[PDB]
Amino acid sequence: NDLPSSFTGYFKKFNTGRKIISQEILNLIELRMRAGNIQLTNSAISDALKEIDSSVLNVAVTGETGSGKSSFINTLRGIGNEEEGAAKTGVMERHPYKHPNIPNVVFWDLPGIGSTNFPPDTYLEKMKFYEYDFFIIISATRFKKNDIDIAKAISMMKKEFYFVRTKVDSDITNEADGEPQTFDKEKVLQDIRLNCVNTFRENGIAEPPIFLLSNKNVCHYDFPVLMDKLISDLPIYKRHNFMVSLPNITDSVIEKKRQFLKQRIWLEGFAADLVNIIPSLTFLLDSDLETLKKSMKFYRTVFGVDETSLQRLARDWEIEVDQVEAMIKSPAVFKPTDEETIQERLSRYIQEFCLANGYLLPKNSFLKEIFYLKYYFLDMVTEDAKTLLKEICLRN
Ligand SMILES: Nc1nc2c(ncn2[C@@H]2O[C@H](COP(=O)(O)OP(=O)(O)O)[C@@H](O)[C@H]2O)c(=O)[nH]1
Ligand SMILES: [Mg+2]
């Protein structure tokens, strides 16, 4: 029940594909912790956090004009095609588009090779191939020789690529229009997937990743599967930043985000050093109070329950933003009030969190109060995200 073991034991409670950093790195930290040199130990923990936090992801998106590159980029960033910062949908060189909340996630819109006079290899060099983590090759219909050859070149250069077939919703709508209930919409998808794969393999790509989706319905088709696969292919430490940037499409995705964020709080908490003082004994320092307000804003944005996200959703709904906010809890925490009231409010949350969850550590050891409060806000915001998801699905 010693501290070093408790530190690593926390992470061991999460499933493999849900750990924030390699268990191997964590076990070395455990070793250093046992050594007792807090100087070196804190430094090692801070280094782990820095690697996670500093991770930058550069995603290349290529394909013919009109295939849906701009839309795909806006969808993953959670931005409407008509909002600012959004890649303008509609008919040069590459253009970057950073995620609005996670600047370290950058999508690059590349001009389709077909619009250039360059062979696959020259095209990739011109587009600064080595700057990307992976490539997304998009087509709204069938994949032409151009697209396929780029894929082969990328593969030959030892980088990952993914084929994304957009506008599948349009195919289903047009084929099903006026047809009896018996029309098989699922079969349309199954046929397109198999046909694409046969074509890819016929052309020399043995294991072509293919995803059929619609930029107008991120919750359906292969979008969820694509997100899981992209995260799975990334080095462990790079997953956190990309994960928190993803659209909050399912309870599973929301829960996965929470799991990653819980681990970051744990790391951050140990980096600040544990104490022997019970967390609910005193009020908070003003600096910690300000940090918590920033933390709440970040969590709300990550989970899509921030002001801007709420406005965007309820624009045309029968219930406006104020009605939507009334259905959740996080928006009320920091409504304007005096400093005493907010201090008293948080001093109660801390007692309640610890009475329900314990101190998460061996007897007499505690994280500084602010971290238990981050867990409290995280749970609150997570629950709000699920509540809102249900409301979104009923209406859109
Ligand atoms: N129905 C439907 N329309 C889409 C989809 N993706 C893109 N579009 C639309 O098709 C057009 C071309 O898309 P755009 O994203 O600008 O692709 P780009 O020209 O490759 O960058 C726009 O009118 C989009 O609104 C999709 O998955 N489904
Ligand atoms: Mg474009």
PDB file of N, CA and C and ligand atoms in Angstrom, residues 61 63-71 73 87-92 97 109-112, ligand 2:
ATOM      1  N   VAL A  61      -5.018  16.144 -45.546  1.00  0.00           N
ATOM      2  CA  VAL A  61      -6.285  15.755 -46.159  1.00  0.00           C
ATOM      3  C   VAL A  61      -6.185  16.093 -47.650  1.00  0.00           C
ATOM      4  N   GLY A  63      -7.421  15.073 -51.955  1.00  0.00           N
ATOM      5  CA  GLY A  63      -8.489  14.551 -52.793  1.00  0.00           C
ATOM      6  C   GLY A  63      -8.934  15.592 -53.804  1.00  0.00           C
ATOM      7  N   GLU A  64      -9.754  15.191 -54.773  1.00  0.00           N
ATOM      8  CA  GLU A  64     -10.227  16.122 -55.798  1.00  0.00           C
ATOM      9  C   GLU A  64     -11.127  17.202 -55.226  1.00  0.00           C
ATOM     10  N   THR A  65     -11.152  18.345 -55.902  1.00  0.00           N
ATOM     11  CA  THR A  65     -11.999  19.450 -55.491  1.00  0.00           C
ATOM     12  C   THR A  65     -13.436  18.932 -55.425  1.00  0.00           C
ATOM     13  N   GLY A  66     -14.180  19.364 -54.414  1.00  0.00           N
ATOM     14  CA  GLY A  66     -15.561  18.940 -54.282  1.00  0.00           C
ATOM     15  C   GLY A  66     -15.795  17.586 -53.640  1.00  0.00           C
ATOM     16  N   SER A  67     -14.727  16.865 -53.312  1.00  0.00           N
ATOM     17  CA  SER A  67     -14.878  15.549 -52.696  1.00  0.00           C
ATOM     18  C   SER A  67     -15.328  15.639 -51.235  1.00  0.00           C
ATOM     19  N   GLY A  68     -15.156  16.809 -50.625  1.00  0.00           N
ATOM     20  CA  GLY A  68     -15.570  16.981 -49.242  1.00  0.00           C
ATOM     21  C   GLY A  68     -14.431  17.146 -48.256  1.00  0.00           C
ATOM     22  N   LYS A  69     -13.304  17.671 -48.719  1.00  0.00           N
ATOM     23  CA  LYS A  69     -12.152  17.867 -47.852  1.00  0.00           C
ATOM     24  C   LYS A  69     -12.434  18.926 -46.790  1.00  0.00           C
ATOM     25  N   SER A  70     -12.906  20.088 -47.232  1.00  0.00           N
ATOM     26  CA  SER A  70     -13.214  21.187 -46.319  1.00  0.00           C
ATOM     27  C   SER A  70     -14.240  20.771 -45.276  1.00  0.00           C
ATOM     28  N   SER A  71     -15.287  20.087 -45.729  1.00  0.00           N
ATOM     29  CA  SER A  71     -16.346  19.630 -44.833  1.00  0.00           C
ATOM     30  C   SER A  71     -15.834  18.647 -43.782  1.00  0.00           C
ATOM     31  N   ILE A  73     -12.804  18.365 -42.653  1.00  0.00           N
ATOM     32  CA  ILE A  73     -11.969  19.141 -41.745  1.00  0.00           C
ATOM     33  C   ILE A  73     -12.804  19.942 -40.746  1.00  0.00           C
ATOM     34  N   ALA A  87     -12.940  25.843 -42.921  1.00  0.00           N
ATOM     35  CA  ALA A  87     -12.409  25.752 -44.274  1.00  0.00           C
ATOM     36  C   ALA A  87     -13.586  26.034 -45.202  1.00  0.00           C
ATOM     37  N   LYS A  88     -13.481  27.083 -46.010  1.00  0.00           N
ATOM     38  CA  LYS A  88     -14.560  27.450 -46.921  1.00  0.00           C
ATOM     39  C   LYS A  88     -14.894  26.327 -47.894  1.00  0.00           C
ATOM     40  N   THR A  89     -16.123  25.829 -47.818  1.00  0.00           N
ATOM     41  CA  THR A  89     -16.550  24.753 -48.703  1.00  0.00           C
ATOM     42  C   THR A  89     -16.884  25.301 -50.090  1.00  0.00           C
ATOM     43  N   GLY A  90     -16.109  24.881 -51.087  1.00  0.00           N
ATOM     44  CA  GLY A  90     -16.329  25.340 -52.446  1.00  0.00           C
ATOM     45  C   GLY A  90     -15.039  25.495 -53.234  1.00  0.00           C
ATOM     46  N   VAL A  91     -15.117  25.255 -54.541  1.00  0.00           N
ATOM     47  CA  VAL A  91     -13.960  25.360 -55.427  1.00  0.00           C
ATOM     48  C   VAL A  91     -13.188  26.654 -55.188  1.00  0.00           C
ATOM     49  N   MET A  92      -2.804  26.157 -56.707  1.00  0.00           N
ATOM     50  CA  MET A  92      -2.858  26.651 -55.338  1.00  0.00           C
ATOM     51  C   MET A  92      -1.961  25.818 -54.428  1.00  0.00           C
ATOM     52  N   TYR A  97      -5.548  24.273 -40.756  1.00  0.00           N
ATOM     53  CA  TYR A  97      -6.736  24.623 -39.988  1.00  0.00           C
ATOM     54  C   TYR A  97      -6.598  23.980 -38.617  1.00  0.00           C
ATOM     55  N   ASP A 109      -5.432  21.122 -45.528  1.00  0.00           N
ATOM     56  CA  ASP A 109      -6.201  20.883 -46.740  1.00  0.00           C
ATOM     57  C   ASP A 109      -5.210  20.961 -47.903  1.00  0.00           C
ATOM     58  N   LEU A 110      -4.975  19.839 -48.577  1.00  0.00           N
ATOM     59  CA  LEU A 110      -4.035  19.827 -49.698  1.00  0.00           C
ATOM     60  C   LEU A 110      -4.755  19.818 -51.037  1.00  0.00           C
ATOM     61  N   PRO A 111      -4.245  20.579 -52.019  1.00  0.00           N
ATOM     62  CA  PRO A 111      -4.897  20.594 -53.332  1.00  0.00           C
ATOM     63  C   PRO A 111      -4.798  19.173 -53.888  1.00  0.00           C
ATOM     64  N   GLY A 112      -5.847  18.698 -54.557  1.00  0.00           N
ATOM     65  CA  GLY A 112      -5.816  17.355 -55.118  1.00  0.00           C
ATOM     66  C   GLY A 112      -4.696  17.220 -56.135  1.00  0.00           C
TER      67      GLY A 112
HETATM   68 MG    MG B   2     -10.838  21.999 -50.135  1.00  0.00          MG
END
